[PDB]
Amino acid sequence: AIIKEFMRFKVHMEGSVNGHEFEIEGEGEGHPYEGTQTAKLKVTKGGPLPFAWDILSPQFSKAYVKHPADIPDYLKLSFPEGFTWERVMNFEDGGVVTVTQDSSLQDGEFIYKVKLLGTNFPSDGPVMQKKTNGWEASTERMYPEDGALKGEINQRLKLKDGGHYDAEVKTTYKAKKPVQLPGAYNVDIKLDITSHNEDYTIVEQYERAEGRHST
């Protein structure tokens, strides 16, 4: 009863990419048990961004993942205290993005604080030149390890001609207090940018995430 059928959230991100410092403030809402959510993001410091929005989009919500009843919903269970996650994204051309995030529930609303550092993107690369057109649907392979929950993704960014820009993503999700971990399973994820102004200083995103068995 702690996680309602309809839940909102606030998100704040402090970040730097290739030395460009920035802040983003956002609000979101969705249906945590059917695995759907939207959010509207606002760059509030250091806008407009000299780099592609798409590397930030997956950092804005695992409480919103549809889970079949036979799989422990570890991250839903972690509330009200919540959980934290830590992520590295390794892109094909040497770009790296590391992220840390804290998730909590306060006054009926999810609170997300995000920290992001990105470096070593090539000046003539698609991220710094903003030639990316959003993510292909992906599959995160989840599994229990070291008492936490881990996720692995081979993620593809669409390139504006028919190619792709790839990234290897590795995340660790940790409940702030021990709750039941699941076995290995898969989460099909699709993230869409639904609206943005010209300089991507206001962005809206949609995401559907649904868990299923690996078998």
Author numbering: 6 to 65, 69 to 223
Question: From the publication, what sentences describe this entry?
Answer:
A modular strategy for protein crystallization using split green fluorescent protein (GFP) as a crystallization partner is demonstrated. In the present study, the protein chosen as a target for crystallization was superfolder Cherry (sfCherry), a version of red fluorescent protein engineered in our laboratory. sfCherry was chosen as a test protein so that the folding of the target could be monitored by red fluorescence while the GFP reconstitution could be monitored by green fluorescence. Our new folding-enhanced sfCherry contains six mutations: R36H, K92T, R125L, S147T, K162N and N196D.
The chromophore is formed from residues Met66-Tyr67-Gly68 and is buried in the middle of the central helix. Unlike mCherry, sfCherry crystallized as a symmetric dimer. The dimer interface includes the hydrophobic residues Val96, Val104 and Leu125 and the hydrophilic residues Asn23, Glu94, Thr106, Thr108, Thr127 and Asn128. Similar to the AB dimer interface found in the Dsred tetramer, the sequence Val104, Thr106, Thr108 is central to the dimer interface in the sfCherry structure, in which Thr106A forms a hydrogen bond to its counterpart Thr106B. A sequence alignment of sfCherry, mCherry and Dsred suggests that the R125L mutation in sfCherry is likely to contribute to the observed dimerization. A native polyacrylamide gel at ∼10 mg ml−1 protein concentration indicated that the protein is approximately 50% dimer and 50% monomer. A homology model obtained for the sfCherry sequence using SWISS-MODEL has an r.m.s.d. of 0.2 Å for the Cα atoms of residues 6–222 compared with the actual structure that we obtained for sfCherry in this study.
